[PDB]
Symmetry: C3
């Protein structure tokens, strides 16, 4: 059916994990400065993203199929999984915001 639709500048929406992960990635290496040698690396492979941060070791952060959707493996706080509530990425365990979690674990490695 309708031609009223496909004559528009259509596009494909984009995964919301994908999105977070960019404003993460760039928000991140763009702190790979204020890294006084101590956050050496951000790497965003292919919906897999790594922090070297020898202070605690290395974080991995994946996209993942549901039962629920972004996966956190923090070498300090350990493992967690996230889905959207009100447009925030939040913890399936107890509903903390992953932003916050990194935001801490990350500020602790400058601070220290």
């Amino acid at each position: 059916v309708p031609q009223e639709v496909l004559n528009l500048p259509l596009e494909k929406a984009h995964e919301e994990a994908d999105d977070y992960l960019d404003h993460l990635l760039d928000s991140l290496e763009e702190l790979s400065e204020a890294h006084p040698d101590c956050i050496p690396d951000v790497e965003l492979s292919h919906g897999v993203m790594t922090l070297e941060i020898p202070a605690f070791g290395t974080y991995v952060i994946n996209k993942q199929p549901p039962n629920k959707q972004i996966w956190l493996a923090s070498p300090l706080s350990g493992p967690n999984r996230f889905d959207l509530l009100n447009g925030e990425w939040v913890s399936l365990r107890n509903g903390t915001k992953l932003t916050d979690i990194l935001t801490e674990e990350v500020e602790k490695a400058i601070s220290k």
Copy 2:
């Protein structure tokens, strides 16, 4: 294992998106009346559903695999995605009810 189960009138539960989309579809063309020419068409293809409504143009509404589940493309309010909270379909962005959203956008096209 058990024969105590498959001797019952068994069935397969049905997608909850599927359900909404019917009591939507029929709730909808059944307003394709009170359409004073101005909501011309509802079309429910194959888990894809279209509103022609030339007042703003044409809405699409899909079933979608998670990262989250019913997709709204409103030619007026733009794009949104929905999952169940308390048995309501609600917005992943901010948790509004999609019922409400259509309910407005739709009443605006008679009103106008």
Copy 3:
């Protein structure tokens, strides 16, 4: 990329349904005692799990792909589907805890 990761005792996280279903399963046959003949069987096939409980008949409990994730077929309360909120398995219909639901339906069959 990094070797700082795969030299750790890595593992694969485990489905959260899977988990519930074990501390369920064992929590369950381990009540297949206090079963005064009246909860005869728990069977955990392959992410499919059955209660014979002739008092109401037989419960099935599945893992299921999302639109949402653990499926309850109670021969008494009928059918329900569950996902995590704050690390609890909760009802998509109205957000009751499935623990509670079984916890009742199950205590009713001793009680009676």
